[PDB]
Write a protein that binds this ligand. Structure first.
Ligand SMILES: *[C@@H]1O[C@H](CO)[C@@H](O[C@@H]2O[C@H](CO)[C@@H](O)[C@H](O)[C@H]2NC(C)=O)[C@H](O)[C@H]1NC(C)=O
Length: 362
């Protein structure tokens, strides 16, 4: 199957062993490595980080020893502002300028395709988003009409029902996109005020869940039913967990919280912990397997973190294989123990490799 992995340019800035550059990625680990994110200035796909061009090369160099490794550049991101993206896609001239600027930029920097990370189209952008995808694929087909291996077009889509209903025309965009990575995580935010695994495989205990849709299973199925071909659907598996600060002695799912979890030493962001940061957290912590959800959560002191580990990701892969999906999508390589020094076993990319093995197994 496909193993789409994201590399986030900003992961380079993390202190010490946290810092991650494309040259630190196992070229054989994934089938597709997506660089995040590229900006859009003057309606042209442009770099984001000062050293993007350098990192671009650093990444694509991984293709030398591995011809089969495809690489995509992801335009969009959360810091992009769906507003700017809305305008660019709304305006017809602006849309063309951008679409046209992509093929060159990709070929110029060694990318095998483009990933649309519009996070996220508004209720008013459903059509614009369909168009943008349709015309972007048009251009990629054109730019390769002569005989070039056509540039790939993918899109990172929300796994949340609400967003899916208001922003995506799954049926349509699924024809034009080569594959869609369904961001099946971040289902439970600190804002809810209770502990909850952010990336459950299934809904789990009926009483214990807030939404009937805040779980991987529902999203995957919802999308399928909405017209997304299973063969074009890549299921997102996070290598990071969402943390919470407990507010009482209760440590189970649905326990009271005072807010996000204490920021991780390297990711410096409340409510988030890279799997490697989690491996340190597990030291002295207690791991609980959430029955029905197939995912673990660890708690220690006033901290609670729901995450994915070797076992859970293996289960998620079975789920997706049993669903006959295109494969798994990982977010992100820099969040996995890419150093292989935090979770012991000296094994680099424990989670992602677990996923790889699971996909190749049986
Ligand atoms: C991505 O592109 C946008 C648009 O060109 C950049 O935003 C401009 O930023 C300057 C100063 O930061 C402002 O004076 C302009 O008015 C902005 N233009 C727009 C359209 O908002 C943005 O800085 C770029 N980001 C990166 C990382 O390249």
């Amino acid at each position: 199957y496909k193993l789409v992995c994201y590399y986030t340019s900003w992961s380079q800035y993390r202190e010490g062993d946290g810092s991650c550059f494309p040259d630190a990625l196992d070229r054989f680990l994934c089938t597709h490595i997506i660089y995040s994110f590229a900006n859009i200035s003057n309606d042209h796909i442009d770099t984001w980080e000062w050293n993007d061009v350098t990192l671009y090369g650093m990444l694509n160099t991984l293709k030398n020893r591995n011809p089969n490794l495809k690489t995509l550049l992801s335009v969009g991101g959360w810091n992009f502002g769906s507003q700017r993206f809305s305008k660019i896609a709304s305006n017809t001239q602006s849309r063309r300028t951008f679409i046209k600027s992509v093929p060159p930029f990709l070929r110029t920097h060694g990318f095998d395709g483009l990933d649309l990370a519009w996070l996220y189209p508004g209720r008013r952008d459903k059509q614009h988003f369909t168009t943008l995808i349709k015309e972007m694929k048009a251009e990629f087909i054109k730019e390769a009409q002569p005989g070039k291996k056509q540039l790939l077009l993918s899109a990172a889509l929300s796994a949340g029902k609400v967003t899916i209903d208001s922003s995506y025309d799954i049926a349509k965009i699924s024809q034009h996109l080569d594959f869609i990575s369904i961001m099946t995580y971040d289902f439970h935010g600190a804002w809810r005020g209770t502990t909850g695994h952010h990336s459950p495989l299934f809904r789990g205990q009926e009483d214990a869940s807030p939404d009937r849709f805040s779980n991987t299973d529902y999203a995957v199925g919802y999308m399928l039913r909405l017209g997304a071909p299973a063969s074009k659907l890549v299921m997102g598996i996070p290598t990071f967990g969402r943390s919470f600060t407990l507010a009482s002695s209760e440590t189970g799912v649905g326990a009271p919280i005072s807010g996000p979890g204490i920021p991780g030493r390297f990711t410096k962001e409340a409510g988030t912990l890279a799997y490697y940061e989690i491996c340190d957290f597990l030291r002295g912590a207690t791991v609980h397997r959430i029955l029905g959800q197939q995912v673990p959560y660890a708690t220690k002191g006033n901290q609670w973190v729901g995450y994915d580990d070797q076992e859970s990701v293996k289960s998620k892969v079975q789920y997706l294989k049993d669903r006959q999906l295109a494969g798994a999508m990982v977010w992100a390589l820099d969040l996995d123990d890419f150093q292989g020094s935090f979770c012991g076993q000296d094994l680099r990319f424990p989670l992602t490799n677990a996923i790889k093995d699971a996909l190749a197994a049986t």
